[PDB]
């Protein structure tokens, strides 16, 4: 699951086999089975295979959730 | 002069001639066969130039020439030095720092020549060992020497493009 969550509510909760995202430290390519880590987003348009405008990125080998506010498809 | 070197240079010129003629023998809308490979290599050099139009022409000619130069060695320093000098002069005319840059260009040409001579020396040592007396090791040596020559040609083209862009 690559479900994103906003204070108003969820937006998308589909499954995926590829994740890409631009973070403040740099670009990241996330794959299933990745080590848990934390990285902050900086007004980036995350792409799966939507916009975030400020938020946090957490990864778990099971699933990845991108919590942020003001996110639209 | 060097009669053998002149004959070899003429041989590479003729080889490039027939290769280009065969590549552009027929014109159509869908490049296939040799035309497909020509389109692919043209796209590759165009992308390299964009990363680092007018100069893509002689860039392609130089790439093909060094490819042929690496090619016939499988079966010279003056030529490499002259080519490096001509490339440096063309880059300067297109537009101790200058002396240093010329030294680096000469060093790059000498490095390509040294790779060629390293391959030649390995082949000669293998031939001498055969005369004294390794088909698979000879095959591996020929393969990786041709591979290294191709990468050296690509690196020389990229360095020339970078120097031209800087100038």
């Amino acid at each position: 699951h690559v479900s994103v969550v906003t204070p108003d509510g969820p937006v998308y909760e589909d499954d995926v086999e590829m994740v890409s995202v631009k973070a403040k430290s740099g670009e990241l390519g996330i794959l299933p089975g990745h080590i848990p880590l934390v990285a902050p987003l900086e007004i980036s348009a995350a792409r799966l295979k939507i916009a975030v405008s400020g938020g946090f990125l957490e990864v778990r080998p099971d699933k990845v959730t991108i919590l942020a506010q003001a996110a639209e498809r | 002069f060097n009669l053998s070197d002149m004959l070899m240079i003429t041989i590479t010129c003729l080889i490039v001639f027939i290769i280009a003629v065969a590549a552009t023998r027929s014109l159509q809308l869908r490049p296939t066969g040799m035309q497909n490979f020509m389109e692919w290599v043209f796209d590759f050099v165009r992308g390299i130039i964009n990363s680092t139009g007018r100069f893509l022409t002689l860039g392609v000619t130089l790439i093909m020439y060094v490819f042929v130069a690496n090619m016939l060695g499988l079966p010279d320093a003056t030529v490499t030095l002259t080519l490096a000098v001509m490339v440096v002069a063309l880059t300067h005319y297109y537009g101790l720092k200058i002396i240093e840059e010329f030294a680096n260009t000469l060093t790059l040409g000498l490095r390509l020549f040294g790779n060629i001579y390293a391959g030649e020396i390995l082949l000669g040592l293998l031939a001498s060992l055969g005369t004294h007396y390794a088909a698979i090791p000879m095959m591996v040596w020929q393969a990786f020497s041709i591979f290294v020559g191709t990468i050296q040609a690509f690196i020389f083209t990229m360095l020339t493009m970078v120097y031209m862009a800087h100038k």
């Binding site: 890409s20 740099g26 | 060093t107 790059l108 040294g114 390293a118 990468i151 690196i155």
Partner: protein
């Protein structure tokens, strides 16, 4: 007959330096491509140009060693 020893010493030094440089570069680009798979073409192109730049000097060293051995 010390020229042979001098040439061998120069060749060995050049080989060690080239090995160190190539190891550093390709080890770093391994992590470079491991962090984000989508950049592989660019990373491999700069990979190859960098290793060629690194190996440039050792070829000159080998040529000088051969000249010294001949002399």
């Amino acid at each position: 007959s010390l020229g042979v020893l001098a040439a061998a010493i120069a060749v060995g030094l050049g080989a060690l330096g080239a090995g160190i440089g190539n190891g550093l570069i390709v080890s770093r680009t391994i992590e470079g491509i491991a962090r984000q798979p989508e950049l592989r073409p660019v990373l491999q192109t700069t990979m190859f140009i960098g290793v060629a730049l690194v190996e440039a000097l050792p070829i000159i060293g080998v040529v000088f060693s051969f000249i010294y051995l001949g002399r």
